[PDB]
């Protein structure tokens, strides 16, 4: 799976002990945010830590994470380290989603400003350095799919970026329920089957008297029958199955702020207030750094 | 403090109404016949005319958008209590009215009026409004028609 929780745990332990060293020297005794009065210390083991402490540590970890040689980490690899940390938390009983939950909103902002400046690196030889975070890393880490409303929203955004080729928040807001037309494919491969796909007209032009309009131009969604879990069509259908009935058919927005509390059998997962520009920008920078999105951007951009 | 019930009729021509108490006779006469007045709704474009002072206060509700009545079940907002009372019938699933020919049950008299067209009954109706010959059965229905439609306005 090329995802190593051990590396994330080790980096966290190194940073935690390093900070604890400085915590005593400052001689500023500040209590921990737990019921019992204790000196604020960062537990070396991730699992036995409070939400506030973990959030504050991951916030500082962005700027104080140090490589094995003592050099600061690159923006392309801090995201991988944090993904490994989250995988460690998930596989040890914790239910905290360090990227989506409201308590960790502070963490994402700092991670966001670290990741925004990133650009693909070109070596002196010439070839571009491939990113260290891949799609399977997100899939295995449960940052994509249909586990929680935020994860499903991020999955739809990721698929839209990959296929429809949306590469900027300002350009990416244009998407709406109405203009995203669903049309069952006219030609199934065999009469027994019935192919389905989703399309979007991302072409910008005068669009006057059938000009600039053609069937082969507007961006399209494929369908994955090999693994239904990752199928874009299934996730889109699930998304529309949980959004409120009133939202469908409106031109203003496509992404809805997930409801704070949701249960396994909750009919509705999303509110009717579209996600703010800040959140869309925060969760779009994290999905450009991924490798497959970079390849998709290059292929369409190149031609 | 309820006084004993007696019935007194407004002897004035054109008003054959009989009231539940002698007390109410004075109020009826004063507020209906003797008090001849004209008012204008303050709204810039309403252009309506109401002789009573009670009616205007109700009319102000129409022009504004203050909804102070909330349904128990669907949390829908209404402007008057009786509108809510009619709405609640949807949630309780009760159909009080019923046609006397085909046994067709409805929730409101507006639905029944539509059904009577199938069982053509306007033939036996005698009343009708002078303007557009509406062919009503009873008398006060003509007043309701003149109020909702053919309105008296400036």
């Amino acid at each position: 799976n090329s995802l190593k929780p051990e590396e994330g745990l080790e980096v966290w332990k190194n940073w935690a002990q390093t900070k604890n060293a400085e915590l005593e020297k400052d001689a500023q005794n500040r209590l921990a945010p737990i019921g019992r009065r204790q000196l604020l210390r960062f537990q070396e083991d991730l699992i036995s830590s409070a939400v506030a402490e973990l959030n504050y540590g991951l916030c500082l970890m962005t700027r104080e994470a140090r490589n094995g040689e003592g050099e600061p980490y690159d923006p392309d690899v801090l995201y991988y380290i944090f993904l490994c940390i989250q995988k460690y938390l998930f596989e040890n009983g914790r239910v905290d989603d360090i990227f989506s939950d409201l308590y960790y909103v502070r963490f994402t902002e700092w991670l966001h400003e670290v990741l925004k400046d990133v650009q693909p690196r070109v070596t002196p030889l010439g070839y571009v350095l491939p990113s260290h975070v891949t799609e399977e890393m997100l899939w295995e880490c449960k940052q994509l799919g249909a586990h929680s409303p935020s994860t499903l929203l991020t999955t739809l955004m990721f698929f839209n970026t990959k296929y429809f080729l949306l590469k900027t928040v300002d350009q990416h807001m244009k998407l709406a329920f109405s203009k995203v037309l669903r049309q069952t494919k006219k030609n199934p491969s065999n009469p027994k089957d019935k192919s389905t796909s989703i399309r979007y007209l991302k072409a910008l032009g005068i669009h006057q008297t059938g000009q600039k309009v053609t069937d082969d131009m507007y961006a399209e969604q494929t369908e994955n029958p090999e693994n239904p879990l990752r199928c874009p069509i299934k996730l889109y259908d699930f998304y529309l199955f949980k959004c409120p009935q009133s939202v469908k058919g409106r031109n203003d927005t496509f992404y809805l702020t997930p409801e704070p509390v949701v249960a396994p059998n909750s009919p509705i997962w999303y509110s009717v207030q579209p996600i703010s520009r800040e959140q869309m920008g925060q969760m779009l920078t994290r999905i450009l750094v991924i490798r497959e999105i970079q390849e998709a951007i290059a292929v369409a951009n190149a031609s | 403090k309820k006084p004993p019930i007696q019935y007194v009729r407004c002897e004035m021509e054109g008003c054959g109404t009989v009231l539940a108490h002698p007390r109410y006779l004075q109020h009826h006469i004063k507020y209906q016949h003797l008090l001849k007045k004209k008012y204008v709704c303050p709204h810039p474009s309403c252009g309506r005319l109401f002789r009573l002072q009670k009616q205007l206060l109700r009319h102000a509700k129409h022009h504004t958008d203050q909804r102070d009545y909330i349904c128990e079940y669907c949390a829908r907002a209404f402007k008057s209590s009786h509108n809510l009372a009619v709405h609640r019938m949807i949630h309780t699933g009760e159909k009080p009215l019923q046609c006397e020919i085909c046994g067709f049950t409805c929730r409101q008299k507006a639905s029944l009026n539509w059904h009577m067209k199938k069982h053509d009954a306007d033939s036996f109706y005698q009343f009708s409004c002078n303007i557009c010959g509406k062919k009503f059965e009873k008398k006060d229905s003509v007043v309701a028609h003149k109020a909702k439609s053919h309105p008296e306005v400036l």
């Binding site: 019921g35 699992i47 959030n55 909103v105 949701v262 | 909330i70 209590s81």
Partner: protein, 379 residues
């Protein structure tokens, strides 16, 4: 159990004159005449200056999760949380079994306000009145304890300790605790304009309790005998006792299903005081408005007849083992009442949408002329 038949003192070797309610100075204002002052005292004991901790350079949930009830108090191990609540009410119903069940339900209702549907442990505080004779103590207290344990059993928890002390008045209560993951309880701090409040139990239980105890005092009954017949008082008392002895487990479970933003309980301070306390907690600038006030049948008439004693129309009448004031979106609320009336598990009960949520300054009011809904005594 006393559910099969009404508690008869003679059946348990008790005299006819005996009544459990005689061991409390009942009053129309409840167990707290100066409601405002007790709010100040509760704020004083809750408020802690060290908990701010320079905000921890971030925005995280507080130890006093909402500052008014059901403190969360995050722990060390496993990042779990410790939601814990306490409550105490003096006897208000003649039946000891039902009174113990009511005390247990009141103790548990605080947790169900936060969405917690499971209790690991519960404690009980049982107080025996000085005036009660020895022959009565060993005949009523076992019934109270049996009712408390039965209520705990229905809640999936066990009473496994407590304390017993002497008191001039019988004091009945407990303490409920639960250690839960961060995703098992709804922290009632979210609220957005457009939501609609939902209530799970009718109001006016205190009026029904007080009137039923006025059937033995000739001076008081003649004042109120005009407006309400004895049969109405009997059925209202029965309904209030049954309602007050009912758990909100189903409501708490459904809270998660229908995306609840905030919730509370109506135990004490009336409906207006609890809404006001809840409004201050909301992060956004939202003020509640209550248009409907479901009341037990015929109790509103008594409430207005007695004068400035209860004031249900003002939302100040205290309640015991009250319902939940849940803030849900409009369509979820529309569905919420439908499911709670006929649950899949069965044994449903009605719920009402009593108001709306609008942009304001973190306050709660009641319209000038609330639409009093008379809930019938169903079955």
């Amino acid at each position: 159990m006393s559910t099969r038949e009404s508690f008869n003192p003679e059946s348990y070797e008790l005299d006819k004159s005996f009544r459990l309610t005689r061991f409390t100075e009942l009053k129309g204002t409840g167990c707290k005449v100066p409601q405002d002052v007790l709010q100040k005292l509760l704020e004083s004991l809750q408020e802690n200056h060290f908990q701010e901790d320079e905000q921890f350079l971030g925005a995280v949930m507080p130890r006093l999760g909402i500052g008014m009830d059901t403190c969360v108090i995050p722990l060390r191990h496993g990042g779990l949380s410790l939601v814990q609540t306490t409550d105490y009410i003096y006897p208000i119903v003649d039946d000891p079994y039902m009174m113990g069940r009511i005390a247990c339900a009141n103790v548990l209702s605080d947790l169900y306000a936060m969405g917690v549907t499971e209790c690991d442990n519960m404690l009980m505080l049982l107080g025996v009145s000085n005036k009660m004779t020895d022959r009565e103590r060993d005949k009523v207290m076992p019934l109270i304890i049996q009712g408390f344990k039965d209520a705990a059993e229905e809640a999936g928890t066990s009473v496994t300790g407590g304390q017993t002390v002497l008191n001039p008045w019988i004091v009945l209560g407990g303490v409920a605790t639960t250690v839960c993951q961060p995703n098992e309880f709804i922290m009632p701090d979210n609220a957005v304009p457009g939501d609609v409040l939902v209530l799970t139990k009718p109001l006016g239980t205190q009026v029904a309790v007080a009137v039923h105890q006025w059937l033995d005092i000739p001076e008081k009954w003649n004042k109120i005998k005009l407006v309400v017949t004895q049969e109405d008082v009997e059925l209202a008392y029965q309904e209030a006792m049954m309602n007050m002895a009912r758990l909100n487990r189903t409501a708490a479970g459904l809270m998660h299903t229908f995306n609840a933003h905030a919730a509370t309980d109506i135990t004490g301070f009336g409906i207006l005081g609890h809404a006001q306390n809840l409004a201050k907690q909301q992060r956004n600038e939202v003020s509640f408005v209550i248009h409907n006030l479901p009341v037990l049948a015929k109790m509103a008439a008594v409430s207005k007849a007695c004068g400035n004693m209860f004031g249900l129309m003002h939302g100040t009448c205290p309640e015991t083992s009250g319902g939940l004031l849940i803030c849900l979106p409009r369509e979820q609320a529309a569905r919420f009442c439908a499911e709670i009336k006929s649950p899949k598990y069965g044994e449903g009960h009605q719920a009402w949408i009593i108001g709306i949520v609008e942009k304001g300054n973190r306050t709660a009011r009641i319209i000038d002329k609330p639409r009093i809904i008379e809930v019938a005594p169903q079955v």
